[PDB]
Amino acid sequence: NLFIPVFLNCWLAKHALENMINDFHRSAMFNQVLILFCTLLCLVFTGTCGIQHLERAGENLSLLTSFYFCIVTFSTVGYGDVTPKIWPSQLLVVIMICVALVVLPLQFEELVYLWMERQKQTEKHVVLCVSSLKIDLLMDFLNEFYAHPRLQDYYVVILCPTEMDVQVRRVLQIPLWSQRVIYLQGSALKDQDLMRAKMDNGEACFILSSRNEVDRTAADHQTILRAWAVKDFAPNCPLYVQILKPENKFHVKFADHVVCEEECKYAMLALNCICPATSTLITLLVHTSRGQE
Stretch that binds another protein, among 112-120, 138-146, 259-267, 273-281 (CB under 8 A): 112-120
Q: Does residue number 110 form part of the binding site for another protein (CB under 8 A)?
A: no
Measured from the CB atom, the residue of 145 and 233 that comes closer to another protein is 233
Strands 125-129 and 205-208, by their bridges, are parallel
- Within 131-190, the residues that bind another protein by CB under 8 A are 131, 161, 166, 169, 173, 187, 189-190
Contacts of 9 (CB under 8 A, 6+ apart): none
**What's the rounded Cα separation, in Å, for the pair 147 and 170?**
21
Residue 215 burial by Cβ neighbours in a 10 Å radius (0-12, 13-18, 19+): exposed
Numbered residues of the known binding site for K(+): 77-78
Measured from the CB atom, the residue of 73 and 138 that comes closer to another protein is 73
Strands 125-129 and 155-160, by their bridges, are parallel
Terminal-to-terminal C-alpha distance of the chain = 93
Secondary structure letter of residue 56 according to DSSP: T
Numbered residues of the known binding site: 77-78, 284, 287
Numbered residues of the known binding site for Na(+): 284, 287
Question: Minimum distance from CB of 147 to another protein (Å)?
Answer: 28
Stretch that binds another protein, among 4-12, 24-32, 135-143, 147-155 (CB under 8 A): 24-32
Binding mask of the shown chain, residues 230 to 269, with x at each position contacting another protein by CB under 8 A: -xxx-x------------x-xx--x---------------
Q: Where are the beta strands (DSSP E) in the chain?
A: 125-129, 155-160, 181-185, 205-208, 239-243, 257-260
Secondary structure letter of residue 210 according to DSSP: -
Binder of another protein out of 76, 122, 212, 289 (CB under 8 A): 76
Question: Minimum distance from CB of 282 to another protein (Å)?
Answer: 29
**What's the rounded Cα separation, in Å, for the pair 97 and 249?**
72
Contacts of 117 (CB under 8 A, 6+ apart): none
Three-state SS at 247: helix
Q: Does residue number 221 form part of the binding site for another protein (CB under 8 A)?
A: yes
Measured from the CB atom, the residue of 22 and 292 that comes closer to another protein is 22
Residues that bind another protein (CB under 8 A): 21-22, 25, 28, 31, 64-65, 67-68, 71-73, 75-81, 83, 85, 93-94, 97, 101, 117-118, 120, 131, 161, 166, 169, 173, 187, 189-191, 217-218, 221-222, 224-225, 228-229, 231-233, 235, 248, 250-251, 254
